[PDB]
Design a protein around this ligand. Structure first.
Ligand SMILES: *[C@@H]1O[C@H](CO)[C@@H](O[C@@H]2O[C@H](CO)[C@@H](O)[C@H](O)[C@H]2NC(C)=O)[C@H](O)[C@H]1NC(C)=O
Ligand SMILES: *[C@@H]1O[C@H](CO)[C@@H](O)[C@H](O)[C@H]1NC(C)=O
Ligand SMILES: *[C@@H]1O[C@H](CO)[C@@H](O)[C@H](O)[C@H]1NC(C)=O
Lengths: 129, 50
């Protein structure tokens, strides 16, 4: 990271104005989590928050959550589905390497679990500059 | 039709407020539950615990 950039993720079976889906986003102040229908017309992005543009549209949502200012530097994640539960794990570690993942051992301690009860089959990353 | 809720009528005429609630099937993990008990702890005694 060293620069943020990667500010969230999008998940769902269909994310083009059909089928319920999930959304996870950050701006270093809080996490904002939604389970709502979306279309993502033009690939959300910062675009420069001197300049900002909101993603997709407001629609038939079913869940929400906000908490925890989320914070070379490397961060690690895991996402998985378990019969209705959506789990997220993570870790932090500063590194010297610049090419790719270094060696060494890293065990991801868990974050809070979400009992959404909706499938996921695709995902894509939110970005910023 | 507009309601004629005049005060000068009997109980049958007088307005009431109604709330109807229902719950969904177990297609996913539950999310609403009644409050759970939180009893005082015990130490150095043989006890049943949950
Ligand atoms: C960007 O950060 C701001 C904080 O400066 C977040 O503002 C909160 O947004 C949630 C969701 O709309 C509201 O419920 C809170 O009331 C807002 N806080 C304040 C102080 O207004 C905002 O959510 C963040 N946005 C993203 C995309 O992460
Ligand atoms: C909104 O989404 C929920 C998801 O379970 C669905 O049950 C409901 O029918 C949807 N409503 C509309 C108007 O699309
Ligand atoms: C996932 O999709 C299957 C069909 O492949 C469906 O039967 C099931 O109800 C869906 N479950 C969730 C949690 O979306």
């Amino acid at each position: 990271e060293k620069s943020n950039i990667i500010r969230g993720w999008i998940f769902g079976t269909t994310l083009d104005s059909k089928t319920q889906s999930l959304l996870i986003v950050n701006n270093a102040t809080n996490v904002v989590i939604k389970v709502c229908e979306f279309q993502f017309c033009n690939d959300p992005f910062l675009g420069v928050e001197s300049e900002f543009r909101v993603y997709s549209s407001a629609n038939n949502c079913t869940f929400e959550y906000v908490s925890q200012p989320f914070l070379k530097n490397l961060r690690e994640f895991v996402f998985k589905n378990i019969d209705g539960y959506f789990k997220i794990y993570s870790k932090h570690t500063p590194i010297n390497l610049v090419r790719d993942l270094p060696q060494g051992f890293s065990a991801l301690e868990p974050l809070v679990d979400l009992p959404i009860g909706i499938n996921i089959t695709r995902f894509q990353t939110l970005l910023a500059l | 039709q507009s309601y004629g809720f005049q005060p000068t009528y009997g109980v049958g005429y007088q307005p009431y407020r109604v709330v109807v609630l229902s719950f969904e099937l177990l297609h996913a993990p539950a999310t609403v539950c009644g409050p759970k008990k939180s009893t005082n702890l015990v130490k150095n005694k043989c006890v049943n615990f949950n």
